[PDB]
Amino acid sequence: SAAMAEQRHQEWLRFVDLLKNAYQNDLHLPLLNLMLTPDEREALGTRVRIIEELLRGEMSQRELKNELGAGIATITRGSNSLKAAPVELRQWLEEVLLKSD
Amino acid sequence: SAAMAEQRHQEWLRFVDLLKNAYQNDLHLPLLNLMLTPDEREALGTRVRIIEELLRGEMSQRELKNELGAGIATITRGSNSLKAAPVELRQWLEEVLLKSD
Numbered sequence: 001s002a003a004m005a006e007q008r009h010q011e012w013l014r015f016v017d018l019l020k021n022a023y024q025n026d027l028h029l030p031l032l033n034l035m036l037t038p039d040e041r042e043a044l045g046t047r048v049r050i051i052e053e054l055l056r057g058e059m060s061q062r063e064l065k066n067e068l069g070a071g072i073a074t075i076t077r078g079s080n081s082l083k084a085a086p087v088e089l090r091q092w093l094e095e096v097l098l099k100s101d
Numbered sequence: 102s103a104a105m106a107e108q109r110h111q112e113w114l115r116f117v118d119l120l121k122n123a124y125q126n127d128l129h130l131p132l133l134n135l136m137l138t139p140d141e142r143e144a145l146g147t148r149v150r151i152i153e154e155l156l157r158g159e160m161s162q163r164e165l166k167n168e169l170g171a172g173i174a175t176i177t178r179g180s181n182s183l184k185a186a187p188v189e190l191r192q193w194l195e196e197v198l199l200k201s202d
């Protein structure tokens with residue numbers, strides 16, 4: 001249903017915009033503690049590390065599984081989503097997540 | 102383990118700070134599409150609606166289940182987390198999520 005998809009999209013943007021405003025008001029931490037579960041906070045921290053290591057290029061995917069405790073399916077999702085991302089985002093992530101050499 | 106808890110906390114803050122910076126650079130939407138699954142975007146949109154309706158106070162919890170398709174367990178989590186939240190956050194959410202009367 002296109003109508004239901006439109007409703008889901010509007011609801012998602014409401015979250016995005018709410019959080020934007022929370023950051024501007026220094027309310028982001030309490031908002032994220034309200035809106036997410038502990039397990040989802042843990043998952044998001046792990047996903048940042050997966051991205052950082054995929055961009056770095058030192059560890060193979062099976063080495064990452066072993067080192068981070070994340071399964072191969074999880075790592076593969078990360079890799080495919082990173083390959084699909086806009087170049088501008090990948091370039092920015094390389095600037096922010098990796099140390100200068 | 103306190104040491105592992107410290108590691109999880111650091112990783113979570115890295116996400117929080119990454120997203121802060123993404124918003125400042127207008128990269129928030131692509132970052133959130135990279136970092137979250139579709140089902141997690143849907144869940145976050147639904148949770149904003151649950152919070153909005155709990156603060157409004159018009160619908161009972163069983164009415165919300167019926168109207169939003171969310172289970173009673175999900176609504177109860179929302180309600181308990183809202184009651185636990187800092188007053189300043191609740192007050193701000195009332196200002197932003199509800200229309201002026």
Ligand SMILES: N[C@@H](Cc1c[nH]c2ccccc12)C(=O)O
Binds near residue numbers: 136
């Ligand atoms: N956008 C990704 C989210 C994701 C899942 N697992 C990950 C691991 C790392 C980074 C992102 C992810 C997806 O839809 O699959």
Ligand SMILES: N[C@@H](Cc1c[nH]c2ccccc12)C(=O)O
Binds near residue numbers: 035036037175178182
């Ligand atoms: N912080 C809540 C997250 C949550 C789960 N279900 C919800 C419904 C609405 C709002 C928040 C939630 C928790 O840990 O339980």
